[PDB]
């Protein structure tokens with residue numbers, strides 16, 4: 001289309017206003033925190049993504065605030081950001097120029113589902129492993145994503161690299177201070193969120209990540225449900241009824257409800273027959289009523305399901321090498337050093 | 349299929365165990381409160397619906413308790429109910445034998461949407477009017493449905509009669525006693541429910557009923573949204589941002605959230621051009637942040653949008669007469685007598 005030139009600031013590094021020109025703008029996503037366009041940086045030819053949200057100017061943008069702080073190979077990189085205005089007065093926009101990634105787990109999963117097939121287990125391990133790695137990263141800053149779903153997981157089909165994106169709902173959780181329970185995409189909401197909890201923790205990202213893993217093994221969302229009551233019923237049909245204890249660990253003030261019938265179901269009678277034992281094991285360890293009983297993200301990466309990735313021979317199905325998975329920084333493993341012995345293979 | 353014979357009790361009237369035989373059982377619905385089959389009563393040939401829910405036997409079934417109490421031409425009739433057992437011990441089922449209705453607003457709406465068309469406004473008036481009439485009825489018993497959605501609105505395409513069904517989530521609300529906020533189908537949840545409210549009132553059925561009306565005029569759900577945050581954003585784009593007052597009327601204890609941008613949108617820029625002014629008016633009067641500011645169900649029936657139904661000539665598009673709409677009982681209008689002068693036409 002037309003060429004656009006703005007004064008932008010780099011995301012990370014020294015704050016030095018610089019000139020940026022981009023073109024070939026098309027829309028490629030929407031959200032309750034703005035539009036996402038694809039674009040081409042003029043002078044380098046590189047494709048980028050620009051997310052445009054309306055800004056109050058009277059209040060900071062937390063998405064920007066968080067993004068500036070991150071830097072990890074599994075989280076989409078913020079290149080620059082700039083403001084702009086619209087047709088109407090007192091109407092400023094914040095624009096985040098981020099790396100552009102070709103696919104998203106949501107599409108790759110839909111594409112396979114449409115083909116009446118399941119995603120090759122090797123991809124399942126690779127995508128899920130990188131999701132947990134990122135999850136551990138942002139949690140170590142005390143940041144909870146609050147919106148983990150397949151559409152927010154970017155993929156590069158060729159390199160098999162996954163990148164967490166959309167920090168629109170992200171927030172740094174602090175003990176004692178309350179949080180709204182209405183964030184997070186239906187199918188991925190942790191029980192505590194459905195129950196109204198406002199004192200939940202980062203472990204809600206793990207429940208979600210677990211919903212993603214299960215969805216990738218089943219070919220459809222594992223806990224669908226129009227109402228929260230239906231989701232709770234789907235969940236109870238797989239984990240069994242919650243003990244009074246558990247319901248309390250999810251949401252202290254809670255308000256009792258009916259429910260009852262069926263309890264402690266076959267976790268193995270959930271997935272297709274060929275489903276790898278370890279994949280089901282990881283799910284159980286991820287979808288737990290008690291939030292503190294859920295594996296942490298780093299412990300998830302150390303799970304046996306991800307052993308193939310640690311294998312010295314491992315290669316993508318297209319003969320190419322696997323993405324970065326062991327280059328853990330000391331800071332990255334400091335939350336649970338002992339894991340290093342499983343995280344970093346012998347040949348490293 | 350096979351013939352089945354049970355000892356059943358009549359829903360309404362004297363409790364006199366009687367023998368019932370039915371056959372031609374097929375499934376026709378599912379839910380978090382049981383399965384719904386279609387069946388044929390042997391000796392009369394009549395088609396009925398049987399909803400089978402697992403029962404605790406140690407606790408009453410509120411759905412049954414409520415259904416026994418109702419009796420109104422716009423609410424599906426309970427004919428009998430009986431218990432039965434399953435393959436496993438300590439596993440009893442409660443079976444509700446109800447009237448069978450051919451269609452549901454959900455299908456009629458999908459069918460038209462598929463045909464790339466909108467439901468004829470006359471049907472919109474007829475269906476919505478009967479929904480409100482029923483809604484007024486159950487509210488007068490202090491019963492809030494809690495699950496008003498198109499799939500729970502049964503229709504008889506020929507007679508154009510609508511019948512409210514599925515009282516699985518229904519409950520008699522009492523001031524002071526708390527209620528869970530996770531009932532109700534996503535798209536139809538009143539803001540107070542999204543905000544976590546546990547002291548909400550029957551007016552939540554009205555917000556839903558309003559979502560239905562709007563969906564029937566647009567051809568798709570008016571407030572879609574994966575997360576509650578997205579729904580709130582869709583809602584704010586049509587009603588404008590909630591004043592601090594309003595947010596308080598929805599949920600006293602609430603926990604603040606980000607949000608902001610856009611406010612007070614064109615209620616008329618929402619629907620197609622040909623959309624009747626009055627239909628949009630009714631919607632505004634139904635989708636109100638402040639719950640007490642929402643029209644009551646009976647006032648909704650008295651709205652101008654429903655004037656065509658009061659017209660002396662009015663006939664279904666198939667030349668047949670319109671269903672019952674004015675036979676209000678004195679008990680029915682006692683909540684707001686003055687409405688009688690608009691409810692019951694001159695020629696009545």
Ligand SMILES: O=C1Nc2cc(Br)ccc2/C1=C1/Nc2ccccc2/C1=N\O
Pocket residue numbers: 028029030036049051076098099100101102103104154165166167
């Ligand atoms: O390449 C991207 N970088 C992003 C950064 C953020 Br933050 C949000 C989205 C994107 C993004 C996206 N890339 C896509 C490719 C196909 C379909 C949708 C998207 C998308 N987004 O919807």
Ligand SMILES: O=C1Nc2cc(Br)ccc2/C1=C1/Nc2ccccc2/C1=N\O
Pocket residue numbers: 376377378384397399424446447448449450451452502513514515
């Ligand atoms: O005719 C009916 N009486 C009912 C009473 C209760 Br309570 C719940 C459902 C029904 C019901 C139903 N009739 C249908 C016709 C087509 C598709 C679904 C249904 C259905 N139900 O899904």
Ligand SMILES: [Cl-]
Pocket residue numbers: 323324325326327
């Ligand atoms: Cl590596």
Ligand SMILES: [Cl-]
Pocket residue numbers: 671672673674675
């Ligand atoms: Cl009449």
Ligand SMILES: [Co+2]
Pocket residue numbers: 031032033168578
């Ligand atoms: Co969003």
Ligand SMILES: [Co+2]
Pocket residue numbers: 230379380381516
């Ligand atoms: Co239901």
